[PDB]
Design a protein around this ligand. Sequence first.
Ligand code: Y01
Ligand code: Y01
Ligand code: Y01
Ligand code: Y01
Ligand code: Y01
Ligand code: Y01
Ligand code: CLR
Ligand code: CLR
Lengths: 421, 421
Amino acid sequence: KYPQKNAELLSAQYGTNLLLLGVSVMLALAAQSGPVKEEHLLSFITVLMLVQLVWMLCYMIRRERERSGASWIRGGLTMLALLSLIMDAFRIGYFVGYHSCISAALGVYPIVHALHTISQVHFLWFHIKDVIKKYETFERFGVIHAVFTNLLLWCNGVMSETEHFMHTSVCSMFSTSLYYLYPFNIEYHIFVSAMLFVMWKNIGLLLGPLGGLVALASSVSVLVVYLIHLEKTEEMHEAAVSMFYYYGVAMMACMCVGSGTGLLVYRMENRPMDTGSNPARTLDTELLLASSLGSWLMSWCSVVASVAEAGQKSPSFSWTSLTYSLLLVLEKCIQNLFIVESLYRPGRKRQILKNICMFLFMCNISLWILPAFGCRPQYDNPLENETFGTSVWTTVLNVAIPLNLFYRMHSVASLFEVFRK
Amino acid sequence: KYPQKNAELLSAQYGTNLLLLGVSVMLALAAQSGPVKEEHLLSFITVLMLVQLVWMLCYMIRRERERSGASWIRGGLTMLALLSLIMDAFRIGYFVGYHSCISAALGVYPIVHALHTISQVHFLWFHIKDVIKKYETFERFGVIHAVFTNLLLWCNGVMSETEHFMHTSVCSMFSTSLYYLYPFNIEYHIFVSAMLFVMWKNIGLLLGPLGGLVALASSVSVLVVYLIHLEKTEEMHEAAVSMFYYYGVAMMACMCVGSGTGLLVYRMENRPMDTGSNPARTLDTELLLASSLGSWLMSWCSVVASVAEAGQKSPSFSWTSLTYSLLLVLEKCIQNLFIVESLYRPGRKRQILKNICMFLFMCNISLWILPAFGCRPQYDNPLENETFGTSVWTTVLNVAIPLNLFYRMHSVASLFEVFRK
Ligand SMILES: CC(C)CCC[C@@H](C)[C@H]1CC[C@H]2[C@@H]3CC=C4C[C@@H](OC(=O)CCC(=O)O)CC[C@]4(C)[C@H]3CC[C@]12C
Ligand SMILES: CC(C)CCC[C@@H](C)[C@H]1CC[C@H]2[C@@H]3CC=C4C[C@@H](OC(=O)CCC(=O)O)CC[C@]4(C)[C@H]3CC[C@]12C
Ligand SMILES: CC(C)CCC[C@@H](C)[C@H]1CC[C@H]2[C@@H]3CC=C4C[C@@H](OC(=O)CCC(=O)O)CC[C@]4(C)[C@H]3CC[C@]12C
Ligand SMILES: CC(C)CCC[C@@H](C)[C@H]1CC[C@H]2[C@@H]3CC=C4C[C@@H](OC(=O)CCC(=O)O)CC[C@]4(C)[C@H]3CC[C@]12C
Ligand SMILES: CC(C)CCC[C@@H](C)[C@H]1CC[C@H]2[C@@H]3CC=C4C[C@@H](OC(=O)CCC(=O)O)CC[C@]4(C)[C@H]3CC[C@]12C
Ligand SMILES: CC(C)CCC[C@@H](C)[C@H]1CC[C@H]2[C@@H]3CC=C4C[C@@H](OC(=O)CCC(=O)O)CC[C@]4(C)[C@H]3CC[C@]12C
Ligand SMILES: CC(C)CCC[C@@H](C)[C@H]1CC[C@H]2[C@@H]3CC=C4C[C@@H](O)CC[C@]4(C)[C@H]3CC[C@]12C
Ligand SMILES: CC(C)CCC[C@@H](C)[C@H]1CC[C@H]2[C@@H]3CC=C4C[C@@H](O)CC[C@]4(C)[C@H]3CC[C@]12C
């Protein structure tokens, strides 16, 4: 009835205009000397979530007229969805337990979002995982609408929520719970938009595990001492922060050595390389680069701030921030190159590669659990504050840290898939 | 010696980090309460231009050890390069004719840029146009460095130049010449980055021409009356601005009717559509969408401002801004769909299609010459100012209008290629 290239071009233009309309509303909102208020942005996003709910309802009632590494993706989606639903339950509980002096749009939004989350998970659980069976104008509209709805939810969570949060026991528990649960909501929308992008575009092992266990035990130790000296008063806090930075430096140096050793083992073994012209390589490559973007931006902001301070011959320079930031950039570059080469290719080289893969696997688990459980000292750095401002540095960190969490989860799954080869 | 997929991944990571370092410097610059000043950004971009000059020198001296619709692209590149070189000559002339109270980085930058421009044009003239003969790590590094150098030059021109310009006859001629020549410099860097993206990714005709001539004569008339009532004092200026808006509305309505008529002629003639799976279709499609982004953002900002003003039941609403902006969005959507379908497919349908193609060809020439020759009243709109602020609206227009010029040039060449079929 209707051609497919025109369907995909119309859907691309529709979704692009949807994104640019949301960006226009956010630009009108940020210039506070104007009539556009935050409830208007929440009403716009609420209407988008309702349209996606209606589409998913029509899709499931159409499919129920017919009858007949996925587990890593489903587990990640379900865990992040449960944390997002817990945060929405806290928001609804606050809305039914407070002095009713805020607008109705802040009550309808956490309810619809919750329904949106549930339905979206159900859809992404059941009607997508190798059960597609057709691609027409209806599914292309739905997938593109879902992509840009989740991107606008990501932008709203990144900017217009923690510039209100990061700027009576029930209020303390509410604020503490929001502080711990926020990056999992942001990463949830990152994860959902990444999956929808994928489906849119397509349609003797001793020393390794032992070093990994040392990495894990050391991360839990640093996490525990930081949370202890964060929960109580400010004494011995800066020792915990310096412990975080020295641990990060040593660990990323060891990960650079491991990934480089893997790359040199690959270089010494010559192969008829790179003849297949694999588009799946391009897909996983763009996922790893898009995940690496946030932490690369954070690290170059720290490098620029430290070099600008060093240009004054100032005190409190200390060389550890430069080493940490540059080693973080270098570590993600070498690890991305190692994973991408590993996924698309005697016995002693198998034992070396498996020990390297288990070491990097447990190191990425460690570097995931350290900010996810609430360490994150970078928000209180006095150097990048007063250079970029508190609002710009906070927004840069809100972009960087959930993308860093998604990067570590994707790298854990990818290194596990590399390991069983 | 070295595999190609690792070369392209390393080059992608290098260029991405180069862009993010430039973005970090710009973020440190925009927060003016800090040590980073504009001469540091100019020094950084100057170093990038010098590195590209050194690479192009080594490439040409390596090639000179060996011996043996392109004209539209070469003509566009050479015209925009000549206008950019004229602007750089004006900057150098000011730097040798003034009170020497600004830093040396503002003298070295317009010289090196001029050399950069000349060398880049020479390279893009001679060593690229079907003479590639090899792709290795050296060329991938050079092409990626050239891409992100031109993107950083585009961002510097968009933001850090007209927030200093748009905020004694020689000073008047200097400022007037900069006002007229600025969008051609921005479009020049857009054009060069688009060409380098392309080469990176790949490696009875009566009523039509008559309506086109009416469109051209009417555009020159509107342009002349606007420039007359802009050069002298403010009387009869708002009549010229309203004439611009009524001309735009009527013309984009006629272009919507023409493009829709072309699409319906395509729909009535059934074909075995869309089997070839053409990646060149994807390439031209991404060029047209990327060009359409700027004007779509500008139009949705105008729609949001007018709807926010209408929500007060205010005076000075007048319905022409909404009609102009929505019709602009709709016109670019239908025209993109028409061009993309036309490029990748009895006699009366040939005459209808050729008349539509000549009409759209001359209409796109008209809508190119109207802002390129200096009309651009959108900067003085009181509605989008005081809603977004003067700086945000000016930056949005500096993104939108050179992209709109590149869009109209690309559409002129594409409609000419469609016409001779
Ligand atoms: C290309 C795909 C993968 C992602 C698309 C990226 C956008 C979703 C992001 C990147 C640029 C971001 C914008 C970058 C800057 C700003 C300006 C910001 O307001 C300002 O700082 C203006 C200055 C002021 O008055 O405060 C409002 C949000 C916004 C539009 C951001 C909205 C979200 C955007 C569009
Ligand atoms: C109208 C003009 C202003 C728009 C054209 C600019 C962008 C559409 C292009 C220019 C070069 C492109 C970049 C060129 C290189 C790449 C690397 C690319 O990664 C890969 O090539 C994967 C490598 C592999 O498949 O193995 C990711 C996209 C990116 C950053 C591109 C992002 C989009 C860019 C900036
Ligand atoms: C693959 C390559 C070619 C594309 C790289 C994407 C970047 C160009 C995007 C991704 C993340 C974006 C950043 C997301 C967040 C921010 C913070 C944002 O800060 C604010 O909006 C100011 C906040 C305030 O004023 O309160 C400014 C834009 C910026 C740096 C964005 C700049 C554009 C970035 C780096
Ligand atoms: C993906 C390819 C095709 C293009 C990459 C797009 C970037 C080149 C653009 C889009 C987002 C832009 C950023 C959007 C917002 C800002 C914030 C702006 O400063 C602010 O407004 C912060 C608030 C303030 O303190 O004023 C500085 C420039 C910057 C980083 C822009 C720099 C240029 C960026 C990175
Ligand atoms: C880690 C996560 C947060 C990053 C993943 C987000 C982006 C990389 C993706 C998500 C969906 C993508 C969009 C999906 C649809 C398209 C349409 C696409 O145009 C076409 O499909 C051409 C159609 C044709 O070939 O005929 C241009 C890129 C774009 C906007 C994509 C831009 C990049 C997006 C935003
Ligand atoms: C294909 C699709 C998926 C990608 C669409 C790209 C957009 C997400 C990019 C392209 C142009 C970018 C805009 C370029 C210019 C600006 C103005 C800029 O304004 C400022 O920096 C504030 C100026 C000041 O404060 O003085 C804010 C970011 C913004 C809206 C950028 C938002 C991000 C945009 C819309
Ligand atoms: C393809 C990719 C993105 C899939 C995502 C990988 C997911 C499934 C993996 C990677 C990181 C893993 C987490 C690492 C740490 C812990 C902490 C532990 O106390 C509970 C399990 C939990 C929370 C793991 C759950 C599974 C997990 C989230
Ligand atoms: C592939 C695409 C981008 C090629 C670009 C098309 C270029 C070559 C075309 C499209 C618009 C054309 C311009 C339209 C208007 C005029 C004004 C006239 O007084 C001088 C010629 C000039 C300046 C034309 C020169 C050629 C031109 C710039």
